[PDB]
Amino acid sequence: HMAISHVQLFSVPVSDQEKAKDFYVETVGFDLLADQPGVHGRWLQVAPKGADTSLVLVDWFPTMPPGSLRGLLLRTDDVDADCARLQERGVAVDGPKNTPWGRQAMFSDPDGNVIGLNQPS
Template identity: 55%
Template structure:
């Protein structure tokens, strides 16, 4: 196998404009692609410089909004990011100290669930 990384993760959303605002304003992601091709809008966002991006897809594209869970985002400053996310109106729980490190959980406006994790200190 020659797989090197995950390129794109589909995040099901109910409203692409609302989702775009959250991912860009609250999470600080960049818009990589935002184009309409026929009836389908391809909206792709990612943290600056990331190898993996998110495609924000709607129900008319075959996805159920709010059904993504367990996606882990790593941060270099968990406390500052949690504070900034709360200030932006995001639902954040934590941070919490766990045997394997520190993390917080958050949801986007559609209920897609993410873990925000500090790098392991091991």
């Protein structure tokens, strides 16, 4: 019986990392956990405050070109307010629409990776 407790982190492919940083931290409001050298380049690691699973903003996997990532869904406690905030902050939002699984919206980062919001029922 495996001792795996959770996903520590996964990777999002970006091109300009400084730009991605400011987007995920200032615009989307993630916490900046680490920004330092890593083995294949600059390790840039972000997460919603207090979450167990963080995201790494990388540029070193050929198999994941910048902006390729889809099907990422972020849980929020208030999808209307978050959409209002994003729009305020100069991001294009698609939604919020209702769905069988909660109230949802979509937007994209500066490379074109597509991020969902979901507030469950």
